[PDB]
Amino acid sequence: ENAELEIVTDYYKIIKTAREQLGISQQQLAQKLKVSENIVKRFESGKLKPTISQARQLEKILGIKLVTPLENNEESEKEFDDTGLTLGDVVNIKEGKKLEHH
Numbered sequence: 001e002n003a004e005l006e007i008v009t010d011y012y013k014i015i016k017t018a019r020e021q022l023g024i025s026q027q028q029l030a031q032k033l034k035v036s037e038n039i040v041k042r043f044e045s046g047k048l049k050p051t052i053s054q055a056r057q058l059e060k061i062l063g064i065k066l067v068t069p070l071e072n073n074e075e076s077e078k079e080f081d082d083t084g085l086t087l088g089d090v091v092n093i094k095e096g097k098k099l100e101h102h
Contacts (some may be wrong), residue, residue, distance in 0.1 A: 005046035005047065006046045007046065009046070009050070010055045011043045011058065012024075013081060014065050014066060015058060015061075015065055016044070017065075017067055017071070017072060018064055018065050018066060019070045021068070021069065023101050025100070025101055026041065028101065029061075032057075033054060033058075033061065034055060035054075040068050046088075057081060058101060060079055060081040060084060061080075061081065062080070063078045063079060063085070064076075
């Protein structure tokens with residue numbers, strides 16, 4: 001049934017373009033949100049949606065949104081979760097912060 005699918009997920013183009021600009025994996029995103037890789041595919045297929053506190057955290061999850069390698073106009077305040085920034089600021093003693101997709 002195609003009425004039980006979704007495109008108004010709050011998870012479309014706007015975020016999608018940009019999470020990919022950061023290269024961070026499905027499994028890595030899922031930690032940034034306390035969920036599974038398997039749920040995040042479920043949103044990207046229209047089968048499931050995030051909740052309101054989660055929708056609240058997606059806005060905040062990247063500090064950003066919007067952009068492809070090509071998208072030039074993007075004027076909006078950078079807006080990131082504090083655990084997203086400030087508890088993120090590690091591995092601190094190494095360069096660039098030593099992430100899993102690096």
